[PDB]
Write a protein that binds this ligand. Structure first.
Ligand SMILES: COc1cc(F)cc([C@@H](CO)NC(=O)[C@@H](C)N2Cc3ccc(-c4nc(Nc5cnn(C)n5)ncc4Cl)cc3C2=O)c1
Length: 342
């Protein structure tokens, strides 16, 4: 087997001429030439079976990506694993190869307003599909937005996704860790389990702000800092919004804060398009019930050059994993069976 920076990649005979792309807690990702379709693909080696949480992310991603088909959502083209459960130690997920991600891109490149507009369109177009399937991505962030050399955008990593469950969204104060901290909506820290579509809209708002300035808008240095950053810009919630928060610990925390005025978007983003800032405001609304929804956002004047509901497709139909890691391995085995010869 070919070796890539220490690891084996058991992907042959079909996939050859491997080259390192990246590493992380997920595993390792390479490009590789596909000897069938004669195109270079990405392959990620995932080794989840000792960790229930890794098994959950792997199963969720596989189940979701196999069902979804959309231009702005990364696919799974093939999955390589051992022929038996006993011999299966790794799962390789083969996906379309992309040049970079928005996190890498924002570290190095100034985006024109036209690029910002086009990227936000593709994010929302993809999200319209995801939400139309009653699915929440729940970890939207620049590193989960893949880009090719012509700036086509694809959402990736569906391992943290859930089916939407808005009647069971309420929880207590400083409970929850939904999303990656900088992209996590205020209600997560206050009273929300992140089981509504408005969680994803918040993250998109944070992405938009970051495209405007190449700097995260709410860079909390740790968990507790995150609400400080958000309220620092948005200001004190209104009486109406506060009254929606019935949990006393959360309400009284907010009431204990000194009055803070809203920092106007045009001062944080003096070079930004005024329409972009109007949409940004509506995505970064404190009250999730008042927050713009994905189809309204697509309809916003900022995106008028692209908006076309007939070309913004929805899923054909809507889409208990409190299970031990051994059971999750079986379900991963069954879910990947269709890519074996048989
Ligand atoms: C503890 O964490 C995890 C444990 C798990 F058991 C499983 C996971 C899974 C599911 O939750 N999560 C991921 O696999 C996420 C984290 N990533 C990483 C990743 C890297 C590259 C590409 C990629 N990259 C490119 N091109 C590219 C990138 N950079 N360059 C210069 N080129 N093309 C095509 C592709 Cl699929 C996609 C992804 C992706 O989805 C996480």
């Amino acid at each position: 087997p070919e070796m890539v920076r220490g690891q084996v990649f058991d992907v042959g005979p079909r996939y050859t001429n491997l080259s390192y792309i990246g590493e992380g807690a997920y595993g390792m990702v390479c490009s590789a030439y596909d000897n069938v379709n004669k195109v270079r693909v990405a392959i990620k080696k995932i080794s989840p079976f000792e960790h229930q949480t890794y098994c959950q992310r792997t199963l969720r991603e596989i189940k979701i990506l196999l069902r979804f088909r959309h231009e702005n959502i990364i696919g799974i083209n093939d999955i390589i694993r051992a022929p038996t459960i006993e011999q299966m130690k790794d799962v390789y997920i083969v996906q379309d190869l992309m040049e970079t991600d928005l996190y890498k891109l924002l570290k190095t490149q100034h985006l024109s307003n036209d690029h910002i507009c086009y990227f936000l369109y593709q994010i929302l177009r993809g999200l319209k599909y995801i939400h139309s399937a009653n699915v929440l991505h729940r970890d939207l962030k620049p590193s989960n937005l893949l880009l090719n050399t012509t700036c086509d955008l694809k959402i990736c990593d569906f391992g943290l996704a859930r089916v939407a469950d808005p009647d069971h969204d309420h929880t207590g104060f400083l409970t929850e860790y939904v999303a990656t901290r900088w992209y996590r909506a205020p209600e997560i820290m206050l009273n929300s389990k992140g089981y509504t579509k408005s969680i994803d809209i918040w993250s998109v708002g944070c992405i938009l702000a970051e495209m405007l300035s190449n700097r995260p808008i709410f860079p909390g240095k740790h968990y507790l800092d995150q609400l400080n950053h958000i309220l620092g810009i948005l200001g004190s919630p209104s009486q109406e919004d506060l009254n929606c928060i019935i949990n006393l610990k959360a309400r009284n925390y907010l009431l204990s804060l000194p009055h803070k005025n809203k920092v106007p978007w045009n001062r944080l983003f003096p070079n930004a398009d005024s329409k972009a800032l109007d949409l940004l405001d509506k995505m970064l609304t404190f009250n999730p019930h008042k927050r713009i929804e994905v189809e309204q956002a697509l309809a916003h004047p900022y995106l008028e050059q692209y908006y076309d509901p007939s070309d913004e497709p929805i899923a054909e139909a809507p889409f208990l994993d409190d299970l031990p890691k051994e059971k999750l391995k079986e379900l991963i085995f069954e879910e990947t069976a269709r890519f074996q010869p048989g």
